[PDB]
Design a binder for this molecule. Structure first.
Ligand SMILES: CCCCCCCCCCCCCC(=O)SCCNC(=O)CCNC(=O)[C@@H](O)C(C)(C)COP(=O)(O)OP(=O)(O)OC[C@H]1O[C@@H](n2cnc3c(N)ncnc32)[C@H](O)[C@@H]1OP(=O)(O)O
Ligand SMILES: O=C1/C(=C/c2cccc([N+](=O)[O-])c2O)SC(=S)N1Cc1ccccc1
Length: 436
C-alpha cells in the first residue's frame, strides 16, 4: 500500500515509449530503508532444500541443456531469437548465435543442470529457458558468494501463465543446494529490490543505415547529410601502443583491472580463470561471428597502461529490402591508470585525467567497433561512462537497466543518473559490474 506509492513514482520516472510472487521472496521491499547490509533469509544449508523437480503443469518436463551439445544449444538460441522480443511486427529480431552462448553460458563453474529449460512432453520443444552462472560479488565492501541469472525466457504463446515464478523457484532450488544463497539479476522492468538504475545510450556508428532501418531518427531542422557528417569516424585508431589481448598480457591486465575496479560499490570479483575466459573468445572466429573484442595499450617498455572490451550482439532485421541485419557493439569492462597518481577519485584534476583518457580509449573502441562491421555502439551510464558519454556523441537512449540483488539488502548505489534522468557528470556511478 505505502510500498506502491514509491513504486509508481519509480515506474513514472522510467516512463518510456499486486506482485504476488516477489511478495513471498527474500527481496528488499520498496519502502524498506536498509540500516545494515547482508542476507534477508535465516542462513539455511543444502539439507533444508529438497532435490525434487518443482511441479510444472501437464505436458511439460524439466531439462538441462548442455551447451557443448550442438543439438540442445540450437533449441536455446532458436527459442531466444524468436521470442526474446515483445512485438511480432517490431522489424527486428534478436540474433543469438552458437558463438555467443558458447561464451556467455560456458563460464568457469558452469553446471549444465544450471542451464535450466522447459520442454513439452510429446514434442520436446523447448518452451522456456532460464540459466545462471556462479560468481562472487563485491556488494559494497563485503564479499558475496553468488550466481548471476540471465537470459530468462518463456515462449510467447505461454505468456501470462505465471510460469516465470516456477522457473525462478527451480533455479533457486538448484542453486541453494550448492551452498550459494544470493544472486544478482538485471531487468528492464521495475520490481521490489532496485539497488541501482542505469540508462542505455547509443553512439551511432553507421547513422545512415540506422536511420534507413528506423533505429534512429532525424532531428528537426537537420539534413540527412548533416547527421552523416556528425558521426563520421576515422578508419584507424589514434592512441599510441594500442593492440589486441594476448594471453601474455593477462597477469598484467587482471591486476590493473581489479585495481581500477575496486572503486565501485558493486563489482563482480574476478579470478584469472574466469577473466581469461570472459575476455578471450574461441580460437579463430571470423569477424562476422566473433563475440568479445578486447584491446590493450602496451607502453614501449612493456607496461600495460589501459585496456577496454566490448561484445557483439546482432539483430536480424525484418521488413526492409535494403538491410537484413543490424550490428550492435555493447561496451563491456575497462581499466585505466590515468587517475592512479591521485589520492581522490573525485578530485577535479583526477576526474579530468580519468576523463580525457577514457575519451581517447572509448573513441577508439568505437572505431574498432565500426571496423568490426557494427552499426551502433552501446553504453550504460554505469561505471565511469558519464565522463565521456556526452563528449563522444553517445546519444541519450530510452531504456533503463534496473539492478537487483536476490537475498541481500543494500543502500542505493549511484547509477550515473540525476533526479531528472540526466547523466551525473559530478558523481558518475558506483555500479561496476556489466550484465548482458
Ligand atoms: C538462489 C539463486 C536463485 C536466485 C533467483 C534470481 C531471481 C531470478 C529472477 C529472473 C531474472 C530475469 C533477469 C533477466 O534475464 S531479464 C530477461 C527477461 N527477458 C525478456 O524480457 C525478453 C523476453 N521476455 C519474456 O520472455 C517475458 O515474457 C517473461 C517470460 C520474462 C515474463 O513475461 P510473462 O508475462 O510470461 O510473465 P509470467 O506470467 O511468466 O510471470 C509473471 C511474474 O514474473 C515476473 N517477471 C516477469 N519478467 C521478469 C523478469 N524479466 N525478471 C524478473 N521477474 C519477472 C513478474 O513480475 C510477475 O511476478 P509478480 O510481479 O506477479 O510477482
Ligand atoms: O532496443 C530496443 C528495445 C529494448 C528493450 C525493450 C524492452 C525490454 C528490454 N529489456 O532489456 O527488458 C529492452 O532492452 S525495445 C526497442 S523498440 N528497441 C529499439 C528500437 C527503438 C526505436 C525504433 C525501433 C527499434
Amino acid at each position: 500500500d505505502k510500498a506502491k506509492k514509491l513504486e509508481n513514482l519509480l515506474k513514472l520516472l522510467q516512463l518510456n515509449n499486486d506482485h504476488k510472487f516477489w511478495r513471498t521472496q527474500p527481496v528488499k521491499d520498496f519502502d524498506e530503508k536498509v540500516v545494515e547490509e547482508g542476507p534477508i533469509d535465516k542462513p539455511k544449508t543444502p539439507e533444508d532444500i529438497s532435490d525434487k523437480p518443482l511441479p510444472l503443469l501437464s505436458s511439460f518436463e524439466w531439462c538441462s541443456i548442455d551447451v557443448d551439445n550442438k543439438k540442445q544449444l540450437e533449441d536455446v538460441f532458436v527459442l531466444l531469437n524468436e521470442n526474446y522480443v515483445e512485438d511480432r511486427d517490431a522489424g527486428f529480431r534478436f540474433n543469438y548465435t552458437k558463438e555467443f552462448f558458447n561464451w556467455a553460458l560456458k563460464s568457469p563453474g558452469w553446471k549444465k543442470d544450471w542451464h535450466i529449460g522447459v520442454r513439452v512432453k510429446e514434442t520436446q520443444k523447448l518452451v522456456a529457458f532460464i540459466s545462471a552462472i556462479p560468481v562472487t560479488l563485491g556488494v559494497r565492501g563485503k564479499q558475496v558468494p553468488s550466481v548471476e541469472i540471465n537470459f530468462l525466457c518463456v515462449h510467447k504463446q505461454l505468456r501470462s501463465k505465471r510460469l516465470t515464478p516456477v522457473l525462478i523457484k527451480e533455479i533457486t532450488r538448484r542453486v541453494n543446494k550448492c551452498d550459494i544463497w544470493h544472486a544478482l539479476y538485471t531487468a528492464g522492468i521495475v520490481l521490489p529490490a532496485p539497488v541501482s538504475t542505469c540508462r542505455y545510450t547509443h553512439r551511432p556508428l553507421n547513422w545512415k543505415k540506422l536511420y534507413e532501418v528506423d533505429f534512429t531518427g532525424l532531428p528537426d531542422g537537420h539534413t540527412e547529410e548533416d547527421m552523416i557528417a556528425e558521426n563520421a569516424l576515422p578508419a584507424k585508431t589514434k592512441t599510441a601502443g594500442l593492440r589486441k589481448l594476448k594471453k601474455e598480457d593477462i597477469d598484467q591486465v587482471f591486476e590493473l583491472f581489479k585495481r581500477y575496479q575496486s572503486r565501485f560499490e558493486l563489482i563482480q570479483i574476478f579470478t584469472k580463470e574466469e577473466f581469461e575466459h570472459n575476455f578471450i573468445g574461441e580460437e579463430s572466429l571470423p569477424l562476422d561471428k566473433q563475440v568479445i573484442f578486447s584491446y590493450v595499450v602496451e607502453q614501449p617498455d612493456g607496461k600495460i597502461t589501459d585496456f577496454f572490451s566490448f561484445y557483439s550482439l546482432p539483430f536480424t532485421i525484418l521488413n526492409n529490402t535494403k538491410y537484413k541485419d543490424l550490428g550492435i557493439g555493447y561496451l563491456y569492462y575497462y581499466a585505466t591508470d590515468a587517475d592512479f597518481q591521485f589520492k581522490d577519485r573525485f578530485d577535479p584534476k583526477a576526474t579530468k585525467a580519468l576523463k580525457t583518457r577514457l575519451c581517447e580509449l572509448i573513441y577508439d573502441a568505437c572505431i574498432l567497433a565500426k571496423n568490426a562491421n557494427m552499426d551502433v555502439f552501446n553504453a550504460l551510464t554505469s561505471q565511469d561512462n558519464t565522463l565521456f558519454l556526452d563528449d563522444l556523441k553517445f546519444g541519450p537512449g530510452d531504456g533503463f537497466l534496473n539492478f537487483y540483488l536476490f537475498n541481500y539488502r543494500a543502500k542505493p548505489i549511484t547509477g550515473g543518473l540525476n533526479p531528472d534522468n540526466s547523466n551525473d557528470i559530478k558523481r558518475r556511478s558506483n555500479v561496476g559490474v556489466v550484465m548482458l
